[PDB]
C-alpha cells in the first residue's frame, strides 16, 4: 500500500490490480508479469525495477520515476505516464496504445518495436531514444524533443510533429520521407 | 506566318491572335502588349524578345526558345510551354495559372510574384530560379529540380514535390515549413 518500502521485493506474477501504491518505494523490485492494471503508482519510485511482461493497462504512473526500468513487452495500454521519468528505460515491444506521456522524460529510452499508436507524447523528451520499428499511427509528438533519436522514415509521415525539435539530419530525413530527393 | 524571319521586329500592341508562327524567328522582337492569345509559337525562337504585358493565354509555346526573354506581367493562362526553354527569362508578375511547363528549362528564371496556381511544372528545371512571392496553390513540381532556387516557406506546404530535387537547406526549410523546430 501507499508509501511502502518495497525495494528489491520479489513480486513477479503478483496480483496487484487496482492496488494503491502511490509514492511507494519499488526500486529494484521484481515485478515481471505482475498484474498492475488500473493500479495507482503516482510518484512511485520504480528505478531499475523489472516490469518485463507486466500488465499496466490503465495504470496511473503520473510523476513516477522509472529510469533504467525494464518494461520490455509490458502492456501499457491507456496508461497515464504524465510527467513520468523514463530515462534509459527499456520499452522494447511494449504496448503503449493510447497511453499519455505528456511531459515525460524518455531521454535515451529504448522504444524499439514499441506500439505508440495514438500515444500522447506532447512535450516529451526523446533525445537519443531508439524508435526503430515503433508504430506511430496517430501518435502526437507536438513540442517533443527528438534530437539524436533513431527514427524510421515512416514516423515522419504518421506522427504529428508541430513544434517538435529535430537535428538537421532528421529535418533532411523528414523531407526525404515526404518524397523529396537529396540525390 | 510560319518560319518567318521577324528578328528585331517592331510588333508591340500588334494583333496576332491565333497566328501561325510555328518555327518563326522572333529573336529580339518587340512584342510587348501584343495579342498572341491562342497563337501557335511551337519551336519559335523568342530569345531576348520583349513580351512584357503580352497576351499569350492558351498559346502554344511547345519547344520554343525564350531564354532571356521578358515576360513581366504577361498573361500565360492555360498556355502550353511543354519543353520550352526559359533560361534566365523574366516572368515577374506573370500569370501562369493552369499553364503546362512539363520538361521546361527555367534555370535562373525570375518568377517573382508569378501566379503558378495549378501550373504543371513536372520535370522542370528551376535551379537558381527566384520564386519569391509566387502563388503555388495546386502547382505540380514533381520530379522538378529546385536546387539553389529561392522559395517561400509556403511553397513547401502547397506544391506537390514528389521526386523534386532540393538542397540540404531547402530540405531543412521544408521541415520548418511543416512545423518542425531546428531552434
Whole-angstrom CA distances from A52 to A18, A88, B143, B183 are: 19, 15, 48, 37
Chain A nearest-CA distance from B170, in A, is: 9
Asked whether the beta carbons of A157 and A137 are under 8 A apart, the reply is no
CA distance A32 to A83: 23
- CA nearest A54: which of A81, A73, A68? A73
| DSSP letter string, A52-104 | TT-B-TT-B-TT-B-TT-B-TT-B-TT-B-TT-B-TT-B-TT-B-TT-B-TT-
The partner residue sitting opposite B175, judged by closest CB among A175, A179, A182, is A175
Chain A nearest-CA distance from B146, in A, is: 10
Cell of B118: 495549378
Using an 8 Å CB-CB cutoff, list chain B residues near A153.
none
CA distance B62 to B69: 15
Q: Which residues pair with A142 in a beta bridge?
A: none
Report which secondary-structure segment, H or E, holds A177.
helix A168-177
CA distance A77 to A94: 9
Judged by CB atoms closer than 8 Å, whether chains meet at A180 and B172 is answered as: no
Cell of B82: 511543354
All domains in chain A, ordered by first residue: 1-183 (2.160.20.80)
Grid-cell match 526500486, residue found: A27
The partner residue sitting opposite B166, judged by closest CB among A162, A174, A182, is A182
Structural determination approach: X-ray
Cell of B126: 528551376
CA distance B1 to B86: 23
- CA nearest B155: which of A62, A79, A4, A180? A180
Q: Which residues pair with A10 in a beta bridge?
A: A30
Beta carbons within 8 Å of A155's beta carbon, 6+ residues apart? A131, A134, A136, A177
DSSP code for B78 = T
Grid-cell match 506500439, residue found: A115
Judged by CB atoms closer than 8 Å, whether chains meet at B168 and A182 is answered as: yes
Q: Which residues pair with A130 in a beta bridge?
A: A110, A150
CA distance A55 to A50: 12
**Given its phi and psi angles, is residue A180 left (phi above 0), alpha (psi -120 to 50 degrees) or beta?**
beta
Phi/psi for A60 (5° steps) reads: -105, 105
Cell of A70: 525494464
Asked whether the beta carbons of B71 and B89 are under 8 A apart, the reply is yes
Asked whether the beta carbons of B87 and B110 are under 8 A apart, the reply is no
Whole-angstrom CA distances from A169 to A147, A174, A182 are: 9, 9, 12
DSSP reduced 3-state for A140: strand
Identify the burial level of A1 via C-beta atoms within 10 angstroms of its C-beta, where 0-12 means exposed, 13-18 middle and 19 or more buried.
exposed
Chain B nearest-CA distance from A35, in A, is: 39
CA distance B6 to B48: 13
CA distance B121 to B123: 6
Strands (E), B4-155: none
Judged by CB atoms closer than 8 Å, whether chains meet at B178 and A161 is answered as: yes
DSSP code for B70 = B
CA distance B91 to B56: 13
Interface of B with A (CB under 8 A): 161-166, 168, 170-172, 174-176, 178-183
Grid-cell match 506544391, residue found: B159
Centre a 10 Å sphere on the Cβ of residue A2 and count the other Cβ atoms it contains: 12
**Given its phi and psi angles, is residue A61 left (phi above 0), alpha (psi -120 to 50 degrees) or beta?**
alpha
Asked whether the beta carbons of A122 and A141 are under 8 A apart, the reply is yes
Chain discontinuities in chain B, listed by preceding residue (C to N exceeding 2.5 Å)? none
Cell of B146: 529546385
Amino acid at each position: 500500500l501507499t508509501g511502502a518500502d518495497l525495494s528489491y521485493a520479489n513480486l513477479h506474477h503478483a496480483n496487484l490490480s487496482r492496488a494503491n501504491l502511490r509514492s511507494a518505494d519499488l526500486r529494484n523490485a521484481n515485478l515481471s508479469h505482475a498484474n498492475l492494471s488500473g493500479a495507482n503508482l503516482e510518484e512511485a519510485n520504480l528505478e531499475a525495477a523489472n516490469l518485463r511482461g507486466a500488465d499496466l493497462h490503465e495504470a496511473n504512473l503520473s510523476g513516477a520515476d522509472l529510469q533504467e526500468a525494464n518494461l520490455t513487452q509490458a502492456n501499457l495500454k491507456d496508461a497515464n505516464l504524465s510527467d513520468a521519468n523514463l530515462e534509459q528505460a527499456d520499452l522494447a515491444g511494449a504496448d503503449l496504445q493510447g497511453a499519455v506521456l505528456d511531459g515525460a522524460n524518455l531521454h535515451g529510452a529504448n522504444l524499439n518495436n514499441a506500439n505508440l499508436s495514438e500515444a500522447m507524447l506532447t512535450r516529451a523528451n526523446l533525445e537519443q531514444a531508439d524508435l526503430s520499428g515503433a508504430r506511430t499511427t496517430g501518435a502526437r509528438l507536438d513540442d517533443a524533443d527528438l534530437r539524436g533519436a533513431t527514427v524510421d522514415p515512416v514516423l515522419w509521415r504518421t506522427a504529428s510533429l508541430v513544434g517538435a525539435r529535430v537535428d538537421v539530419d532528421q529535418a533532411v530525413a523528414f523531407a526525404a520521407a515526404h518524397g523529396l530527393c537529396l540525390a
